[PDB]
């Protein structure tokens, strides 16, 4: 008596990326038993509970919300954080910070935009907030952001940060930020993480997570772009509209191709919301722009898959 | 033998504007018969057809891709359009333009950046596409930007513009664009458009349009920041997904609130994809956090909708 689990069938290229707001571009897999992957945003059970930083809107993923504060001497603005609904921001809220906030370390290049309550006046400047500097304390509450303005902010009035792209310092190695998989000190460099969703990892041998990428837009130097997520957005939204219950630990997917009726792949999709293939290796996965995923059958973490 | 159709059960604020990136806020009705209104984003029937520019991403809605050109003696680039994938753009396929091109006319203003394939360069610099400028030629294969830079793009690299608010002309009466209900002139303003979604409105006395609004952000001068979109865009992938058949011309929801149990209003919501209430005025309407709507019957266009 249990409501039937499915995933959509909205193609790869056809849904969003949960952790930016960015289509999908492909699905990659590789190893990662050397480090911890523990993003954040894009966290959500098969059964529809959202986790971590998860929210359901693909378009205020990586955004900010509040007031700002002009640093003097510089073109640095502190923003007081709201809540996602513009509401006063509660720190002791059982999540790890607010809902949306960037889940890696990075400097994220986008505008942040202001309107004046009293006469509709209005004011947009290119901004950059770096997640792994000292100033990122999201959970206590303020972030702060370089803009390219030293006085035409307001205090006091609703200003919003959309991002767009990642930045890299050019003078030193290429590609080494942003670095997706390191998660941002939420309160700050002497205060531990809270409330996270968990660390995830493939048990089975020969087995590799299997990642929903995209290409972040670059918005100056060398940065790498590559962001993977463990969900599609819309896999969230799904999972959070139909919360059928998880039958057992692993759902069997398999990947098929409309234009051969045949599977391409099979996959685990774990209850705690994330997929694991059987590979070794890094590997862009080459797929038709019709396939879709289509959930089979409950099985579980001993189940072993056909070699993708 | 019909498909049960269905709506998603997101909440309002759960969900996503289809005419801008951006969240849903408030339902809002006002009359519309001294108007067409033909918006080109945000349209798909009942059974999943989905019409105009309208595409299935909530994030590439008002974005653009292609590669640029710098027009000298300016801060204006061209860019020469690739569809929504980038490849080659074909001006003969049978849509007003590019999916998700803006269907208003307006200053948008957002981030344009670029990535050398060569070395993974980056670069990014605020930009602004006017939709009713003369340049403005997007079924033809190109629009114009204005930046701040005069020198920095390349040439023959894959160039985005990611939107993210509006603007106005401060030394004009304020709120005079965006003009949300004019479309651009697709090909330029001696062409006629092609292809377009059909203009929509109640035909029963006493009913309007019930439309899904968000606030755009403004980034200079005194902008109408206002959006109404007929389709909130998680609606739009759910027909495309579901597919199921229209069984009548109207489909009657009834909008709940489950804290009390019951019915707040119902309304209708047409097979060629838009919904119209029983109610004579403008109205921002005052919804529960947690209300959804639901469908409960097909009717047709001659059901009687009680007063909203």
């Known amino acids: 008596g249990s409501k039937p689990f499915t995933v959509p069938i ?96 990075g400097k994220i290049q986008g505008l942040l935009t202001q309107t004046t309550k009293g006469d509709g006046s209005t004011r947009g400047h290119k901004a950059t907030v770096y997640t792994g500097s000292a100033p990122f304390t999201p959970k206590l509450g303020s972030v702060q952001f370089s803009t390219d303005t030293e006085n035409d902010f307001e205090t006091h009035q609703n200003t919003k940060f959309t991002p767009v792209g990642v930045i890299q310092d050019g003078s030193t190695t290429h590609r080494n930020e942003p670095q997706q998989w390191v998660l941002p000190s939420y309160s700050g460099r002497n205060v531990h993480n809270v409330h996270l969703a968990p660390a995830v990892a493939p048990t089975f041998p020969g087995e590799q997570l299997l990642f929903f990428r995209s290409t972040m837009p670059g918005c100056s130097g060398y940065p790498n772009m590559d ?56 590997h862009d996965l080459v797929i038709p722009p019709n396939g879709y995923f289509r959930f089979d059958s409950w099985v579980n973490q001993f189940y072993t898959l056909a070699p993708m």
Chains 1, 2 share one sequence.
């Open 227 to 282: 962001l993977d997520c463990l969900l599609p957005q819309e896999w969230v939204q799904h999972f959070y509209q139909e919360a059928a219950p998880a039958q057992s630990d692993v759902a069997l997917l398999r990947f098929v191709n409309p234009d051969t009726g045949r599977v391409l792949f099979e996959c685990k999709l774990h209850k705690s919301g994330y997929v694991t293939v059987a590979h070794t290796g890094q």
């Open 10 to 105: 909205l193609t790869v290229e056809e849904m969003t990326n949960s952790r930016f707001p960015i289509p999908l571009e492909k699905l990659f897999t590789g190893p990662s038993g050397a480090f911890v992957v523990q993003p954040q945003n894009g966290r959500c059970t098969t059964d529809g509970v959202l986790l971590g930083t998860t929210q359901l809107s693909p378009v205020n993923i990586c955004t900010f919300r509040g007031d700002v504060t002009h640093i003097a001497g510089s073109r640095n603005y502190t923003m007081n954080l709201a809540s996602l609904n513009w509401n006063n921001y509660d720190p002791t809220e059982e999540i790890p910070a607010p809902l949306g906030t960037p889940d890696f370390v």
